[PDB]
Amino acid sequence: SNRFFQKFYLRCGNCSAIQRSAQGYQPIANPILFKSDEHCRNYHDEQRRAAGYSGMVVTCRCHRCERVHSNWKVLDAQQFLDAKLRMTPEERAQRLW
């Protein structure tokens, strides 16, 4: 349930391929027949993604090594430019997209 959009820049651990994976708009569980557990843990969980995947294992499939794992280090987008701007123009074709 993320009302707002946000795109992370996940860095794999196997190939360090900085791929970006966004988070769309997934609507709130219905309030009409409210359910206190499914809501208040939808919200509290939403701060934990909004703060750069704080307390969650990230599970997205790589683009370089085509496989899905849980090894991603979520890069704040000024730690990403720290990395992107500091790669020779060829390895940007290797690790970035």
Partner: protein, 98 residues
């Protein structure tokens, strides 16, 4: 370079070392280059989209749900109405019996 969230203050300390990462310094300089006429070489904010995205002026779903749910009920009353005058006929000749 993304938009910092709401909880982060909106402050561009100006053109300084690595100013182009300050999202507000970047998109403000990017705007004076318009009023000045300088040619912005770098790319524009690419608003990302999904497979299942819908356009803005979408095709609404309620006025088609209720225009449909009535056909359902008028396709049913149409069925359940066969021989209704014959049916209600014997409704009386049984009530007139009691």
């Amino acid at each position: 370079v993304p938009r910092p969230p709401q909880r982060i203050r909106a402050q561009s300390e100006g053109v300084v070392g690595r100013w182009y990462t300050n999202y507000w310094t970047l998109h403000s300089v990017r705007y004076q280059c318009q009023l000045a006429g300088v040619e912005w070489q770098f790319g524009e904010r690419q608003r990302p989209r999904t497979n299942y995205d819908e356009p803005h002026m979408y095709t609404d779903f309620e006025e088609t749900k209720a225009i449909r749910d009535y056909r359902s009920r008028w396709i049913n009353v149409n069925r359940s109405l066969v021989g209704m005058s014959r049916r209600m006929k014997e409704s009386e000749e049984e009530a007139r019996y009691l």
